[PDB]
Short mmCIF file of all heavy atoms in Angstrom, two decimals:
data_model
loop_
_atom_site.label_atom_id
_atom_site.label_comp_id
_atom_site.label_asym_id
_atom_site.label_seq_id
_atom_site.Cartn_x
_atom_site.Cartn_y
_atom_site.Cartn_z
N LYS A 16 6.72 17.68 5.48
CA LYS A 16 6.40 17.44 6.88
C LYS A 16 6.16 18.76 7.59
O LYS A 16 6.79 19.78 7.29
CB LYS A 16 7.54 16.68 7.57
CG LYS A 16 7.85 15.33 6.96
CD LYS A 16 8.72 14.48 7.88
CE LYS A 16 10.04 15.18 8.22
NZ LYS A 16 10.93 14.32 9.05
N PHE A 17 5.24 18.76 8.55
CA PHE A 17 4.93 19.96 9.32
C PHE A 17 4.48 19.59 10.72
O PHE A 17 3.95 18.50 10.95
CB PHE A 17 3.84 20.80 8.64
CG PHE A 17 2.49 20.16 8.65
CD1 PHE A 17 1.48 20.67 9.45
CD2 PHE A 17 2.22 19.06 7.86
CE1 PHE A 17 0.23 20.09 9.46
CE2 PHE A 17 0.96 18.48 7.86
CZ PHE A 17 -0.03 18.99 8.67
N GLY A 18 4.70 20.51 11.65
CA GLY A 18 4.20 20.38 13.00
C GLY A 18 5.14 19.63 13.93
O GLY A 18 6.16 19.06 13.53
N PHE A 19 4.77 19.65 15.21
CA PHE A 19 5.47 18.90 16.24
C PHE A 19 4.46 18.49 17.30
O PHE A 19 3.40 19.10 17.43
CB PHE A 19 6.62 19.72 16.85
CG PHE A 19 6.17 20.67 17.93
CD1 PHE A 19 6.34 20.36 19.26
CD2 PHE A 19 5.60 21.89 17.59
CE1 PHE A 19 5.94 21.24 20.25
CE2 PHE A 19 5.20 22.77 18.57
CZ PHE A 19 5.37 22.45 19.90
N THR A 20 4.81 17.46 18.05
CA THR A 20 3.93 16.88 19.05
C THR A 20 4.13 17.55 20.40
O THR A 20 5.26 17.84 20.80
CB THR A 20 4.17 15.37 19.18
OG1 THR A 20 4.38 14.80 17.88
CG2 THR A 20 2.98 14.69 19.84
N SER A 21 3.02 17.80 21.10
CA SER A 21 3.04 18.42 22.42
C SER A 21 2.82 17.37 23.49
O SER A 21 1.89 16.55 23.39
CB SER A 21 1.97 19.51 22.51
OG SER A 21 1.88 20.02 23.83
N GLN A 22 3.67 17.39 24.52
CA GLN A 22 3.58 16.38 25.58
C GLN A 22 2.39 16.62 26.49
O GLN A 22 1.70 15.67 26.89
CB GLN A 22 4.88 16.35 26.39
CG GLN A 22 6.11 15.98 25.58
CD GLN A 22 6.06 14.56 25.06
OE1 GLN A 22 5.63 13.64 25.75
NE2 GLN A 22 6.51 14.37 23.82
N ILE A 23 2.12 17.88 26.85
CA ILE A 23 1.08 18.18 27.82
C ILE A 23 -0.31 17.90 27.25
O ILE A 23 -1.26 17.64 27.99
CB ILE A 23 1.21 19.63 28.31
CG1 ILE A 23 0.55 19.79 29.69
CG2 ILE A 23 0.60 20.60 27.31
CD1 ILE A 23 0.45 21.22 30.16
N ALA A 24 -0.45 17.96 25.92
CA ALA A 24 -1.74 17.67 25.31
C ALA A 24 -2.16 16.24 25.56
O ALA A 24 -3.36 15.95 25.66
CB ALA A 24 -1.68 17.95 23.81
N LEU A 25 -1.20 15.32 25.69
CA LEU A 25 -1.53 13.93 25.96
C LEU A 25 -2.19 13.76 27.32
O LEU A 25 -3.07 12.92 27.48
CB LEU A 25 -0.28 13.06 25.86
CG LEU A 25 0.47 13.13 24.52
CD1 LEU A 25 1.93 12.74 24.70
CD2 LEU A 25 -0.21 12.25 23.49
N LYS A 26 -1.77 14.56 28.31
CA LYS A 26 -2.31 14.47 29.66
C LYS A 26 -3.49 15.41 29.89
O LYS A 26 -4.18 15.27 30.90
CB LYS A 26 -1.21 14.76 30.68
CG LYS A 26 0.12 14.07 30.37
CD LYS A 26 0.00 12.56 30.44
CE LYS A 26 0.86 11.97 31.54
NZ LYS A 26 0.97 10.49 31.42
N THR A 27 -3.73 16.36 29.00
CA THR A 27 -4.89 17.23 29.09
C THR A 27 -6.15 16.46 28.69
O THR A 27 -6.11 15.67 27.74
CB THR A 27 -4.72 18.47 28.20
OG1 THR A 27 -3.55 19.19 28.61
CG2 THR A 27 -5.93 19.38 28.30
N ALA A 28 -7.25 16.70 29.40
CA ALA A 28 -8.49 15.96 29.21
C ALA A 28 -9.65 16.92 28.97
O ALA A 28 -9.73 17.98 29.59
CB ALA A 28 -8.79 15.07 30.42
N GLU A 29 -10.55 16.53 28.07
CA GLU A 29 -11.74 17.32 27.74
C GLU A 29 -12.98 16.59 28.24
O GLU A 29 -13.11 15.38 28.07
CB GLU A 29 -11.82 17.55 26.23
CG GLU A 29 -13.13 18.15 25.73
CD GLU A 29 -13.24 18.12 24.22
OE1 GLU A 29 -12.28 18.55 23.54
OE2 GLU A 29 -14.28 17.66 23.70
N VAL A 30 -13.89 17.34 28.87
CA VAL A 30 -15.08 16.78 29.50
C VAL A 30 -16.30 17.55 29.02
O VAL A 30 -16.32 18.79 29.09
CB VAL A 30 -14.99 16.82 31.04
CG1 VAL A 30 -16.22 16.20 31.67
CG2 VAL A 30 -13.73 16.12 31.51
N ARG A 31 -17.31 16.83 28.54
CA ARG A 31 -18.56 17.46 28.15
C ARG A 31 -19.39 17.80 29.38
O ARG A 31 -19.29 17.13 30.42
CB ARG A 31 -19.35 16.55 27.21
CG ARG A 31 -18.83 16.52 25.79
CD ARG A 31 -17.81 15.41 25.59
NE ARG A 31 -17.57 15.14 24.17
CZ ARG A 31 -16.50 14.52 23.70
NH1 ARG A 31 -15.55 14.08 24.49
NH2 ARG A 31 -16.39 14.34 22.38
N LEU A 32 -20.22 18.83 29.27
CA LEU A 32 -21.01 19.28 30.41
C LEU A 32 -21.98 18.20 30.87
O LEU A 32 -22.16 18.00 32.08
CB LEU A 32 -21.78 20.55 30.04
CG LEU A 32 -22.60 21.20 31.16
CD1 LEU A 32 -21.71 21.95 32.12
CD2 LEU A 32 -23.67 22.12 30.57
N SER A 33 -22.60 17.49 29.93
CA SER A 33 -23.62 16.51 30.30
C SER A 33 -23.04 15.36 31.12
O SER A 33 -23.78 14.72 31.88
CB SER A 33 -24.30 15.96 29.04
OG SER A 33 -23.35 15.69 28.03
N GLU A 34 -21.74 15.08 30.99
CA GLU A 34 -21.16 13.94 31.69
C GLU A 34 -21.14 14.12 33.20
O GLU A 34 -20.94 13.14 33.92
CB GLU A 34 -19.74 13.67 31.18
CG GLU A 34 -19.67 13.30 29.72
CD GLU A 34 -18.27 13.45 29.15
OE1 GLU A 34 -17.76 14.59 29.14
OE2 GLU A 34 -17.69 12.44 28.72
N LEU A 35 -21.35 15.35 33.69
CA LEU A 35 -21.34 15.56 35.14
C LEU A 35 -22.46 14.80 35.83
O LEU A 35 -22.42 14.59 37.04
CB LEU A 35 -21.45 17.05 35.45
CG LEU A 35 -20.28 17.95 35.01
CD1 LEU A 35 -20.43 19.34 35.61
CD2 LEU A 35 -18.94 17.34 35.39
N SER A 36 -23.48 14.37 35.07
CA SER A 36 -24.55 13.58 35.66
C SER A 36 -24.02 12.26 36.22
O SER A 36 -24.50 11.78 37.25
CB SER A 36 -25.65 13.33 34.63
OG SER A 36 -26.43 14.49 34.42
N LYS A 37 -23.04 11.67 35.54
CA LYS A 37 -22.45 10.43 36.04
C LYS A 37 -21.79 10.62 37.40
O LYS A 37 -21.65 9.66 38.16
CB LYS A 37 -21.44 9.89 35.03
CG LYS A 37 -22.02 9.55 33.67
CD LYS A 37 -20.98 8.91 32.77
CE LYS A 37 -21.62 8.29 31.54
NZ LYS A 37 -20.74 7.27 30.91
#
Side-chain angles (χ1 to χ4, degrees):
Chain A
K16 300 195 302 184
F17 69 109
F19 82 101
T20 319
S21 173
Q22 298 295 320
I23 203 188
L25 303 156
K26 316 296 243 192
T27 301
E29 169 191 311
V30 181
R31 284 91 165 160
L32 183 77
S33 43
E34 298 162 298
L35 295 190
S36 285
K37 299 185 167 201

